[PDB]
Design an enzyme around this catalytic site. Structure first.
Site, PDB file in Angstrom:
ATOM      1  N   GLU A 134       0.825  -1.203   0.000  1.00 51.52           N
ATOM      2  CA  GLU A 134       0.000   0.000   0.000  1.00 51.52           C
ATOM      3  C   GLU A 134       0.862   1.256   0.000  1.00 51.52           C
ATOM      4  OE1 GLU A 134      -3.157  -0.221  -0.409  1.00 51.52           O
ATOM      5  OE2 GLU A 134      -4.036  -1.886   0.717  1.00 51.52           O
ATOM      6  N   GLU A 149      -4.279   5.523  -1.207  1.00 58.22           N
ATOM      7  CA  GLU A 149      -3.181   4.591  -0.830  1.00 58.22           C
ATOM      8  C   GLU A 149      -2.538   5.068   0.467  1.00 58.22           C
ATOM      9  OE1 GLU A 149      -3.753   1.948  -2.102  1.00 58.22           O
ATOM     10  OE2 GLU A 149      -3.919   1.967  -4.275  1.00 58.22           O
ATOM     11  N   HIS A 199      -4.985   3.649   3.044  1.00 54.05           N
ATOM     12  CA  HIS A 199      -4.828   2.178   3.142  1.00 54.05           C
ATOM     13  C   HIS A 199      -3.584   1.834   3.948  1.00 54.05           C
ATOM     14  CE1 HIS A 199      -7.318   1.481  -0.843  1.00 54.05           C
ATOM     15  NE2 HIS A 199      -8.026   2.023   0.144  1.00 54.05           N
ATOM     16  N   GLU A 249      -3.848  -5.291  -8.487  1.00 57.69           N
ATOM     17  CA  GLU A 249      -5.135  -5.044  -7.785  1.00 57.69           C
ATOM     18  C   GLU A 249      -6.282  -5.818  -8.423  1.00 57.69           C
ATOM     19  OE1 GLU A 249      -5.552  -0.787  -7.969  1.00 57.69           O
ATOM     20  OE2 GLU A 249      -4.112  -0.441  -6.344  1.00 57.69           O
ATOM     21  N   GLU A 305     -11.216   0.458  -4.163  1.00 58.33           N
ATOM     22  CA  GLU A 305     -10.461  -0.118  -5.303  1.00 58.33           C
ATOM     23  C   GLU A 305     -11.135   0.012  -6.665  1.00 58.33           C
ATOM     24  OE1 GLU A 305      -6.816  -0.632  -4.517  1.00 58.33           O
ATOM     25  OE2 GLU A 305      -8.345  -0.868  -2.961  1.00 58.33           O
ATOM     26  N   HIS A 331      -9.669   2.509  -8.613  1.00 62.44           N
ATOM     27  CA  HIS A 331      -8.324   2.189  -9.081  1.00 62.44           C
ATOM     28  C   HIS A 331      -8.366   1.258 -10.289  1.00 62.44           C
ATOM     29  CE1 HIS A 331      -7.082   2.868  -4.577  1.00 62.44           C
ATOM     30  NE2 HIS A 331      -7.775   3.869  -5.084  1.00 62.44           N
TER      31      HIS A 331
END
Ligand code: FE
Ligand code: FE
Lengths: 385, 510, 159, 385, 73
Positions: free
Chosen positions: B99, B129, B132, B194, B228, B231
């Site tokens: 992360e 991030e 996270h 991911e 996510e 992302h």
């Protein structure tokens, strides 16, 4: 389907397995981090030593070489990314002690208050008392043109976010960049609000963009921003030239001393609301930048004269480029209605004296730079109409 | 004047975000790359800074209230089975570094982009991030206060640098995300890291944790998972932006295949080992989970979705499927043999676990259970015996090697997977490689792979001195953080390791 | 570690910019790349290099001027000329092996504090771009035996 | 010590006891409340029908008489506490749908932003550009004197909090009172801040209190507030005379049109920050007051002409007392520096026209009151120097 | 001018709360009673509206997160 807390059989098995006594007595998370303040804080515990750095980068705890590198042999992180040196890159502490949760908490509070204030202001009909010339020309054009200055200073942080050698500095740089982009978006929000209140007001960015890229008044500004954005790669130099020299003089003048001050002499009740947010962001970023560049780098025990040499050279160059920008910008006073003590030569002279003296006391005395405020004031005022 | 209550919503501000850029001559990227990004690429989520902060604060308050008030009142910290309690020490700390490096990867992708909306999306990813990283730190922060063995949760950042499993982690989630072309790092982090591995894993870790009596990890990870999708959108938009470039048709599939092999080479063994060998209640065999994750979900759906832009399925998928059956058992044997170098307590499989292993992996008994039973009989868990599994392996003709590229341990004589041993000499140094793709990587770019393994670093040194210099002891200064059993009595100390007299040899001395 | 201490003792004796330039260039040529002359400092050379880089930076800021610090290389030659010459030399390389040799030698010779940070980073990016574009073409065409022959490696064991 | 979720034995016993099927299918809380909007909201579910009222109070669901009463026989709650009548006292809905949690959430956000802004403003040194006469005399004395107007309007809610016949109206009144007291405390906070910035500035309340109780300029204000505070007992009349007539004219003029407007022509950057909070509170209270007194009472299906009669009488009386207060207050324009378009007779005439026209459209047209704006403007301007 | 970061805390505002009242003839209670309250009675907690709201919001977020997320899971 079945959980270990609520299942009787699994709970009984786990209770049988769990020892009846503790196996260790140290319950502090990352106790070996050295505290800056009296006791170790949650910000330091959750932040420090998150970046895995070998021992040949100062302050690191790992060993060996990187597992994968760039083509040709460039390391993932190396000592070749900056001119300044230190005995420990893990020394920086944010004075405000901001990690993700308090940061988003504060910004969310600001965002919900802004919406409430806009609804009340729209209901109350306060736009009727604004000066028509000020709102039509000066605000709509030049306040919109300041947007691109904010956007360029925001984009200057891309390389700092990748090449930085620590983990607190990374947070500080990321938060500063998010503040700059929030300033640009807030300027555009105010323009859009005034467009729904006043009929005939245009909130498109065509005229402000044409002013930014073509008008002489901002000619000296673009240049400076451009060299800070795509002209240099050293991340320490980017941070210093962007927040401690160029912004603290030119942006401070343009934001505080022209737009906020002249709004309060032309009967504008909307601009100070956004300018207050801009100033709060500036002060919060200034605290961290001053800590990093004065407490850690310029006052290093081993180095420090080396860092002071580089910092003085950078300050000379970028102070010359900020004085050029200010002398270019000061030609906007010929487009406004004359007001004694604010718009005439004396008011501008005192405004410049305030800005330059504040910058002197804030940065130059701490770094060792020698400045003559009167010479700077005369150099800028040579462009007064 | 109109006196109706109005405000400004984010979609109205976002409409003008494209026109914030202006063209000058030196408006280019600062990093070396092979592709150029399209100037007119748009973003799929209409996010500005204030809206982002509002959403994140709304998530964080819900996440933190539970942990700090309810689970603490319930006393749920000490109601987790010990094996999972020691598995989480490795899992959370290993997810934290990935992360963290995603921060720099996304910052380099924002540096490389040309459109303003694409930059806005990458900035949002950077902030996510950071969040996270802090959440993964907070999990270990909570275990340090409320769990019955806080030794491994206390100082993982300092004590993780002794063992062999940490180097492969740095290659896949630390140096594989930030070193190389920007698009190569993009496809390493989003299209494979991911989309194919991390996102399925955050859902599986929660179910295993709740099966083993843990409710902190579900609380944190279910909230982590909600970010996510943005992302994945970032990765899709990065692939769409490079499609019209001529380079794409020249290099994209090569980078995709290299990234896929790099990621799978370490996540196939390690995740399976940590799941199956670090739990008391088994949710599912790891092979089926891997099949449904990589072979059918990512391998089929995502690859078919991007096939219209020229992307092809990797040519190394057959080898991954072939070795995704026994790899985690070999890695488990390697991790059991070198337990003094870790920072967590281990436990050999008991009778019920052996029955499950034989039921789901026919043939597990005759190969692995015999070795485990012999180790148990020789005094694996008894401090007074002085039994070191590595010395037993060396005296029986089984040698351990470390791959030069991947950094994964390998035992050629006790491995049922794919790959063979290759020993080369170049410029006066000897290197050992374990598969064809890593061998090609090392033979094509020898300057990028110069990492040191622990055999080279520790050669000729006594084990207890290595443990003591890396701060591997507990608070009292003699007991070791790592243990071969999960009981609370008869722990190993530095003198017990010193009595055995293990000295690290040179595997390649020949 | 005693190797670190004795190399630091040798480093502390440098008192001139030319001496420190020769020292750092010799050390980097001897112990740095995969094409290094010796492997006897494998686990200690990245610390000694950082010590030498700190001494040369201190000497530079104590001896040179601002114009020298910004525009000139430590060898006394103009940084822009060095960048132009080395990019011209890379562009003329025919194969990937000559290209990687050129890149490695440039990193071994002109690396901060010897060359200013900005020019070095800009030149390194350009060289890396050319190197990557040249390497990645036809990545899977050559068999492993042919690759072993091309790299010039000696096979010691093959299971 | 032992809990029913984590004990295996107790969990097993409870699992044995709990039925395997649901005994009822209706899972909506207080489904019988009639929704004002499309669907029933959490505010209505948690708010409505919390007050136990017998059937002889309109809209009640209970029966019988109160168990205990006052000496002499006064009920705990009765129909004798107000002149206005309705078929249901449970009809009022707050437009903002505020119960305790969102209310404290919003006020907390405002309180944390205020502290951050004050710290940044203090660091930035923006106080140097303020007009010395304005700050020394007008702000420090008369802005401080407005504090007691706010405090009296706050204290007017004590009887409304006890005698009200509903449960949403009680929340609305309590929140309005808390807004008034917050306004008074914010004025005092600004005075204290300016006292720590400027040496020689006095933040004591002695001079503002002497101005409030003795100075002629506020003589017409006190009176009105006093009769609204300790002169009447009907809670509907208190609400109407305090928020819909007196405040919306006099307080709106004094807050918006004198202090906020003249701060922006004298270079004051601090006052609008607090005046914005005051205006947001005013608009939020206005929404609820307008809903209560227009949607429910004046537009009743059975009554409504009765309520309109009483409302028109109250409006006549208290509009006369607000016009007296404004004509008395308008004498402060002789103490300020003359500014064209703001301080001269024309600027004040347009300011009064704006205030009276806004009040007309907001309340008088909806209630049925007839007003001539020109006559009111001339009556107020008869006191202009 | 002094350019040090300052704010105002609630105890400083609360110091002046007593002087917000002014004496006029009809300043009395509206309800029947047998006692009279002392004019100089003080309060033991130094609370204003903004501080009260801050504390209550801090309590409410902790209370609601648990019920709406954890016990429901
Ligand atoms: Fe993430
Ligand atoms: Fe991610």
């Amino acid at each position: 389907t079945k959980r270990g807390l609520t299942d009787p059989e699994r709970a009984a098995i786990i209770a049988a397995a769990v020892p009846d006594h503790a196996l260790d007595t140290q319950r502090k998370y990352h106790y070996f981090i050295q505290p800056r303040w009296k006791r170790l804080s949650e910000y330091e515990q959750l932040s420090c030593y998150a970046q895995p750095n070998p021992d040949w980068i100062a302050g690191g705890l790992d060993w060996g070489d990187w597992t994968q590198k760039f083509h040709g042999g460039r390391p993932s992180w190396g000592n070749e990314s900056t001119e300044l040196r230190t005995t420990d890159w893990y020394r920086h502490r944010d004075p405000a002690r901001r990690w993700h949760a308090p940061y988003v908490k504060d910004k969310s509070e600001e965002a919900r208050y802004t919406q409430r204030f806009l609804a009340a202001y729209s209901s109350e009909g306060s736009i009727r008392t604004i000066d028509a010339y000020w709102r039509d020309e000066i605000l709509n054009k030049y306040y919109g043109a300041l947007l691109y200055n904010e956007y360029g200073l925001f984009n200057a942080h891309s390389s700092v976010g990748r090449d930085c050698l620590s983990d607190t500095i990374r947070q500080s740089a990321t938060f500063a960049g998010l503040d700059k982009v929030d300033n640009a978006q807030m300027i555009q929000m105010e323009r859009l609000f005034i467009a729904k209140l006043v009929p005939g007001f245009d909130a498109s960015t065509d005229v402000p963009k044409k002013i930014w890229t073509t008008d002489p008044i901002y000619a000296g500004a673009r240049g400076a921003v451009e060299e800070i954005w795509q002209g240099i790669q050293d991340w320490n130099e980017i941070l210093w030239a962007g927040h401690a020299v160029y912004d603290a003089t030119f942006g401070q003048f343009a934001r505080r001393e022209f737009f906020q001050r002249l709004a309060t002499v032309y009967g504008d009740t909307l601009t100070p609301f956004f300018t207050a947010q801009s100033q709060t962001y500036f002060q919060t970023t200034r605290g961290a930048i001053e800590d990093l560049f004065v407490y850690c780098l310029a006052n290093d025990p081993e180095f420090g004269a080396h860092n002071r040499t580089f910092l003085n050279a950078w300050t000379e160059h970028y102070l010359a480029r900020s004085v050029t920008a200010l002398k270019d910008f000061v030609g906007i006073y010929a487009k406004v209605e004359k007001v004694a003590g604010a718009t005439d030569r004396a008011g501008v002279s005192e405004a410049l004296q305030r800005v330059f003296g504040d910058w002197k006391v804030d940065y130059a005395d701490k770094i060792g730079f020698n400045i003559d405020v009167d010479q700077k004031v005369d150099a800028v005022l040579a462009g007064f109409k | 004047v109109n006196r109706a209550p109005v405000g400004v919503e984010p979609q109205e501000v976002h409409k003008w975000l494209q026109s914030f850029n202006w063209d000058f001559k030196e408006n280019r990227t600062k990093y070396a790359t092979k592709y150029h990004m399209a100037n007119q690429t748009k973003e799929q989520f209409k996010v500005i800074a204030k809206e982002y902060a509002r959403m994140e604060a709304a998530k964080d308050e819900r996440q933190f209230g539970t942990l700090l008030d309810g689970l603490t009142r319930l006393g749920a910290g000490n109601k987790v089975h010990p094996r999972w309690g020691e598995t989480m020490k490795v899992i959370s700390n290993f997810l934290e570094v990935g992360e963290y490096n995603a921060i720099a990867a996304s910052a380099m992708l924002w540096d490389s982009a040309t459109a303003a909306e694409q930059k806005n999306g990458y900035l949002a990813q950077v902030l996510d991030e950071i969040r996270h990283t802090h959440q993964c730190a907070f999990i270990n922060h909570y275990y340090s206060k409320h769990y019955h063995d806080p030794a491994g949760h206390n100082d993982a950042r300092r004590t993780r640098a002794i063992g062999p499993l940490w180097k492969g982690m740095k290659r896949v989630f630390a140096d594989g995300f930030i070193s190389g072309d920007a698009v190569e790092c993009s496809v390493n982090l989003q299209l494979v890291g991911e989309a194919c591995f991390t996102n399925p894993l955050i859902v599986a870790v929660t179910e295993w944790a709740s099966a083993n009596g843990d409710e902190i990890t579900p609380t944190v990870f279910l909230s982590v998972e909600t970010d996510e999708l943005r992302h994945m959108a970032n990765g899709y938009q990065t692939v769409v932006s490079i499609a019209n470039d001529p380079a794409a048709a020249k290099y994209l599939n090569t980078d995709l295949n290299n990234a896929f092999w790099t990621q799978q080479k370490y996540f196939t063994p390690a995740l399976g080992y940590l799941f199956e060998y670090g739990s008391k209640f088994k949710v599912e065999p790891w092979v089926k989970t891997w099949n449904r994750w990589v072979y059918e979900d990512w391998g089929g759906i995502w690859i078919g979705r991007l096939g219209k832009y020229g992307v092809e399925s990797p040519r190394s998928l057959r080898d991954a499927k072939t070795d995704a059956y026994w790899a985690h058992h070999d890695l488990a044997l390697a991790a059991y043999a070198l337990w003094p170098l870790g920072f967590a307590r281990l436990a050999l499989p008991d009778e019920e676990d052996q029955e499950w292993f034989e039921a789901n992996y026919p043939g597990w008994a005759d190969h692995y259970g015999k070795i485990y039973n012999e180790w148990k009989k020789l005094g694996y868990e008894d401090p007074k015996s002085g039994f070191i599994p590595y010395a037993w392996l060396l005296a029986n003709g089984h040698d351990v090697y470390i791959d030069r590229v991947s950094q994964v341990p390998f035992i050629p004589s006790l491995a049922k997977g794919s790959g063979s041993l290759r020993v080369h000499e170049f410029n006066g140094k000897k290197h050992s490689l374990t598969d064809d793709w890593g061998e090609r990587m090392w033979l094509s770019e020898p300057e990028r792979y110069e990492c040191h393994n622990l055999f080279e670093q520790y050669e000729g040194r006594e084990l207890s001195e290595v443990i003591a210099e890396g701060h591997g002891v507990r608070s009292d200064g003699k007991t070791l953080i790592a243990q071969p059993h999960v009981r609370g009595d008869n722990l190993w100390t530095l003198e017990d390791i010193k009595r055995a007299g293990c000295v690290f040899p040179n595997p390649l001395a020949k | 570690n005693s190797t670190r201490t004795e190399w630091e003792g040798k480093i502390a004796k440098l008192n001139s910019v030319d001496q420190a330039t020769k020292f750092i260039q010799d050390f980097r040529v001897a112990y740095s790349s995969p094409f290094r002359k010796s492997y006897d400092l494998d686990v200690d050379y990245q610390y000694i290099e950082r010590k030498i880089e700190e001494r040369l930076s201190v000497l530079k800021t104590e001896k040179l001027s601002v114009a020298d610090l910004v525009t000139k290389a430590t060898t006394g030659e103009d940084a822009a000329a060095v960048e132009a010459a080395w990019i011209a030399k890379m562009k003329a390389a025919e194969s990937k092996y000559a290209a990687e040799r050129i890149h490695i030698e440039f990193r071994q010779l002109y690396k901060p504090p010897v060359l200013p940070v900005n020019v070095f980073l800009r030149t390194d990016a350009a060289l890396g771009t050319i190197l990557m574009e040249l390497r990645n073409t036809d990545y899977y065409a050559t068999p492993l035996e042919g690759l072993r022959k091309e790299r010039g490696v000696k096979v010691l064991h093959l299971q």
